[PDB]
Design a protein around this nucleic acid. Structure first.
Lengths: 43, 204, 119, 101, 132
RNA sequence: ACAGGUUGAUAUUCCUGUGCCAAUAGUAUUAUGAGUUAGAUGGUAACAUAUAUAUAAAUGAACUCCUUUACAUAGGCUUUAC
RNA sequence: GAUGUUAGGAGGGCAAAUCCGCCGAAUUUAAGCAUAUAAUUAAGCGGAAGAAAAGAAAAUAACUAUGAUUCCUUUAGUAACGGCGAGUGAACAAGGACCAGCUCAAACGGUUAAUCCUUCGUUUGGUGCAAACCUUUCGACGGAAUUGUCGUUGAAUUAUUCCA
């Protein structure tokens, strides 16, 4: 919707933040990854 | 001496003066709210003879409990088992009514305290009224005294909820020893468990 | 970069002033980071750990000062009393637990259990 | 009424409240934010989520020579607060912006 | 309808008679806390407390007993007029419970008994006993 | 609480203009108009009356009595706006 | 009996294997099933501890008698219960492990409740770097307590002997 409650909005942001792929320099020293369309957050 | 006279006076009961008196007391109690503190023991002789010891944080509570059976609790008045268990109406609880009364004060209502004991007080068709003696363990008078001290230990919380009151000793059958009570003694479950217990050794 | 023991001697005003100064520096490092700059990005870690050190010294100093004020008295605030278990806090004092009725005391005094040997 | 015989509990420490440096975290360096600073004399600041407008206005005046005509705020998706602080004519934004970055 | 044994606690001494008896007792109020400490520091009396009173009545150590009207459990005083009559000691039921307490330095008291008083007053004690 | 404008992505929310609404403590000054030498007038009536940078201001307690808030459906008729 | 953001304190919840109260089935077995059986089980709900519960004779025996409680070994698939079907089912002794006793109440003590507690204080210590703990006697001022706290465990009295 247009509207949200603040906890819900913050959580949606948290999930979005969680998605972000593994940092490229780290690999020089993933398996779990939300994709929006076919894999709903549900919460 | 004083207590002996009062004991015998209360012992007779259906003597005029006592009978009038019990009725008057019963009238007062029928008005009063279900659990309440009383000033000083209503029956000094029984209370003192039992657990009560007067100085500081020993407190008296008068409790009212409903009489008779409890009815089997199965919804809408039918039980779906075998005919042996189909009887709703006449079923009878294992705990005695006195124990339930100690419970009703003992649980949340007075739950700072610890229930020590309880005495009879009075009766009517609708209610039995009991008085419960309870004691505080967070106040110095019980902590200091070498007598009675034990009740402050952490292992004696909720005696009334565990069958560790005189009523509790009663319905577990712990009051009567000897061959007549047989299996009760180390606890009824415990005794059953020991008898069932099937034992082997390394070499047989 | 600075180390705890050198801090511990210092006056409370000076200690607080030093903390405020480090905070301002820390803010400056962040402002640099937010801009396109990369150059001093490593230095912020040092500053932050130093900030933490300064805070630890001041809080500890206050705690000592407060305990020193509330000597004796039988009535410290709850926080400064023992942080032993709830089960321990509720429990009897050993002194109380030990104590015994006079006749029992008389009995033990008269007939102590004793050490003995045989043929 | 009340008369505690000693304090119940005492806070020892330096305050754990959100301080002025830390309340406002850093200026925003987006293309959009540079444009706003240029064209309408308006400075864009990132702040802590639990900030409120009054606190930001006081804080900005303390932390910089800025005086604030109106402060607009929004909560981003990423968890950071974005404050548009509209400058008063008492000073002119560009120099003050140039000095901070 | 009230049973006789309960009923008999209604009829106190007259108020004026009660005051006179109380006044007569008053000087034989037992040794008080500060006084006791003073006596100890250097180097008869009215006896109270229901258990102690019953023994005093039983053994005919009692000579005059004063009974409070209105203790909340009637039972703890109920036997007392009957007992006093049977073991044949003069007894009196007095109107005010609190004052009998005041007489022994307490917030309340149940009964108070007088075994003997000074020779100069023995006639007056006999008069109270006669009234009772 | 509206119009116009404005950005790569927002706008009755930013910008420009214009307003409106709600607060707006105590104390002391000032200025604004009233009433007084403790409470204005008009109008036959229905009722009307403060145009001060601002229609601000027309004594009123307890206790009461109302009203607005605040209402179905159908059918036509009529007026204004688009 | 109310009332108190009065002063000091306490309970709530989580955790369950063992542990304690309740409440409480049925699938099942009987070649069916109705009593029995499954089972004083499972589920349900309450409560504890490092173990708990039990415990100091309203016991058993019928002997040359034993002697708090628990557990093991056992009696015993026995006495016994039971459509006397299916099935169920103890106790006493005996051999051990361990081995521990007690106090209220009741009686007795009034030329003096000898008790108890909060708050204020006050000192003989000992540890510890400090923090802090740990011992330690001595007074106040409140209260509480005879509607019964404390002492004593029939009562004195002799010789002996001990302990603080």
């Amino acid at each position: 919707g247009s509207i949200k409650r603040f906890r819900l909005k913050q959580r949606l942001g948290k999930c979005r933040r969680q998605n972000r792929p593994v940092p490229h320099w780290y690999r020089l020293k993933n398996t779990k990854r939300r994709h929006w369309r076919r894999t709903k957050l549900g919460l | 001496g004083a207590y002996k006279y009062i004991q015998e006076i209360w012992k007779k009961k259906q003597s005029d003066a006592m009978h009038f008196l019990l009725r008057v007391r019963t009238w007062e109690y029928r008005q009063l709210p279900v659990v309440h503190r009383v000033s000083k023991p209503s029956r000094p002789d029984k209370a003192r003879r039992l657990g009560y010891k007067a100085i500081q944080g020993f407190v008296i509570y008068r409790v009212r409990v409903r009489r008779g059976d409890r009815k089997k609790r199965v919804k809408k008045g039918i039980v779906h088992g075998k005919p042996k268990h189909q009887g709703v109406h006449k079923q009878k609880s294992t705990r005695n009514l006195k124990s339930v009364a100690e419970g009703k004060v003992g649980k949340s209502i007075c739950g700072n305290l610890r229930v020590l004991n309880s005495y009879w007080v009075g009766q009517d068709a609708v209610y039995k009224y009991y008085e419960v003696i309870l004691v505080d363990p967070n106040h110095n008078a019980v902590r200091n005294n070498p007598k009675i001290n034990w009740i402050c230990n952490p292992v004696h919380k909720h005696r009334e909820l565990r069958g560790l009151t005189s009523a509790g000793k009663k319905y577990r059958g712990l009051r009567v020893k000897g061959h007549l009570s047989a299996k009760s003694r180390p606890s009824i479950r415990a005794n059953w468990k020991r008898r069932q217990l099937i034992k082997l050794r390394k070499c047989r | 970069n600075v180390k705890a023991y050198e801090l511990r001697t210092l006056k409370k005003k000076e200690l607080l002033d030093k903390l405020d100064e480090l905070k301002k520096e820390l803010s400056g490092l962040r402002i640099s980071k937010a801009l396109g700059n990369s150059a001093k990005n490593s230095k912020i870690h040092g500053v932050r750990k130093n900030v933490a050190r300064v805070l630890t010294v001041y809080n500890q100093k206050r705690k000592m000062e407060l305990r020193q004020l509330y000597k004796n008295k039988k009535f410290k605030p709850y926080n400064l009393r023992k942080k032993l278990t709830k089960n321990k806090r509720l429990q009897l004092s050993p002194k109380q637990k030990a104590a015994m009725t006079l006749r029992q005391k008389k009995k033990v005094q008269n007939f102590p259990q004793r050490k003995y040997l045989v043929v | 009424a009340r008369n505690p015989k000693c304090p119940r509990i005492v806070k020892s420490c330096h305050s754990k409240t959100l301080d002025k440096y830390g309340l406002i975290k850093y200026p925003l360096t987006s293309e959009k934010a540079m444009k706003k600073i240029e064209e309408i004399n308006t400075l864009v600041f990132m702040c802590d989520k639990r900030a409120n407008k009054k606190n930001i206005k006081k804080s900005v005046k303390n932390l910089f020579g800025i005086e604030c005509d109106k402060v607009n705020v929004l909560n981003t998706l990423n968890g950071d607060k974005k404050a548009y602080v509209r400058l008063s004519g008492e000073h002119d934004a560009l120099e003050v912006a140039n000095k901070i970055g | 309808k009230v049973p006789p044994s309960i009923n008999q606690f209604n009829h106190t001494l007259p108020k004026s008679q009660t005051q006179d008896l109380l006044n007569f007792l008053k000087a034989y109020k037992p040794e008080s806390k500060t006084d006791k400490k003073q006596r100890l520091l250097n180097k008869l009396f009215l006896k109270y407390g229901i258990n102690h009173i019953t023994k005093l009545v039983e053994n005919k150590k009692a000579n005059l007993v004063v009974i409070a009207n209105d203790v909340s459990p009637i039972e703890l005083v109920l036997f007392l007029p009957a007992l006093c009559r049977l073991k044949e000691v003069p007894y009196c039921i007095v109107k005010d419970k609190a004052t009998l307490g005041k007489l022994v330095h307490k917030k309340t008291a149940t009964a108070v008994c007088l075994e003997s008083v000074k020779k100069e007053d023995q006639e007056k004690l006999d008069y109270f006993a006669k009234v009772c």
